């Protein structure tokens, strides 16, 4: 029941393969919905459920805004290089903004900036204040706090326009966003030196949240479990692994336990 709309704008001073000079991308509930970059010079849809509910006027508006951002990012990279007394080279400037609809029906708004991979400045729409996360951002906090009309336009957008769009987009995406795909689980084992490494892998599940654990005689072995981060497949489903090292003679005591929204009860799996 929670939802999110987020835009990420990223500029680099020294482009490379896969890293255009400027990119702007949108995400709904973590799903990529559109893309602009400095090479294409236009914003296009990246999910057919989004494409089927938008039109040329919509994309031309996103393109005009993204072209404006691209111009601003080129100026800001040079402002930041001078702010920090840096040489020319490889630098990154980033913005993330957007809005959340939470489980209680309440909303949150975001507008935050990162320079060189570090928090720089962030806007609090509830208070109309900027917070400098780095000393070199205090000059910017003072400049941008004098721009009251612009702050009010951001507040109105984050609280109204952004959420109004998110609620529509969640409706456009219902068939994809609300789907459930079960994990396909495999247990494998490797004996090395009177150590047996048991591996449990869950494949192809959706949505992303999952619980995977190793049990000994039904008892969770949390301190002994190694687990990977949840990572995506090419079809937008997910994968996770968990391992445990056990005495080969005790192999029959161990089961992998998987819990997921697609499953009507916990999955229990033996090697």
């Amino acid at each position: 029941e929670p939802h999110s709309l987020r835009y990420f704008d990223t500029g680099v001073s020294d482009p490379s393969p896969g890293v255009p000079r400027f990119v702007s991308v949108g995400y709904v509930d973590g799903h990529l919905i559109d893309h602009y970059d400095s090479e294409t010079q236009r914003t296009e849809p990246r999910a057919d459920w989004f494409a089927a509910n938008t039109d040329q006027q919509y994309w031309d508006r996103q393109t005009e805004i993204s072209r404006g951002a691209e111009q601003i990012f080129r100026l800001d990279l040079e402002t930041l290089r001078e702010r920090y007394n840096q040489s020319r080279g490889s630098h990154t400037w980033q913005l993330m903004y957007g809005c959340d609809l939470l489980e209680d029906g309440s909303t949150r708004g975001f507008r935050q900036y990162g320079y060189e991979g570090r928090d720089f400045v962030a806007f609090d729409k509830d208070t109309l204040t900027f917070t400098a996360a780095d000393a070199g951002a205090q000059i910017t906090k003072r400049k941008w706090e004098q721009e009251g009309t612009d702050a009010e336009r951001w507040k109105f957008y984050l609280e109204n326009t952004c959420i109004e769009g998110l609620r529509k987009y969640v409706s456009y995406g219902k068939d994809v966003l609300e789907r459930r795909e079960r994990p396909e689980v495999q247990v494998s084992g490797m004996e090395a030196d009177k150590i047996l490494t048991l591996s449990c892998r869950a494949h192809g599940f959706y949505p992303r949240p999952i619980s995977i654990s190793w049990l000994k005689d039904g008892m969770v072995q949390e301190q002994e479990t190694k687990r990977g981060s949840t990572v995506p497949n090419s079809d937008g489903t997910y994968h996770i692994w968990a391992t445990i090292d056990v005495l080969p003679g005790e192999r029959d005591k161990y089961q992998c336990r998987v819990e997921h929204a697609s499953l009507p009860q916990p999955g229990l799996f033996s090697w």
């Binding site: 835009y7 704008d9 702007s24 949108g26 919509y58 508006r61 996103q62 805004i65 993204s66 404006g68 951002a69 601003i72 100026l75 800001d76 402002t79 930041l80 702010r83 913005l95 903004y97 910017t140 400049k143 941008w144 721009e147 612009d150 336009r153 951001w154 957008y157 984050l158 326009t161 952004c162 769009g165």
Partner: peptide, 9 residues
């Protein structure tokens, strides 16, 4: 839908 950026550093 995006927000227009209207200020520079």
């Amino acid at each position: 839908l995006r927000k227009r950026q209207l200020t520079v550093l």
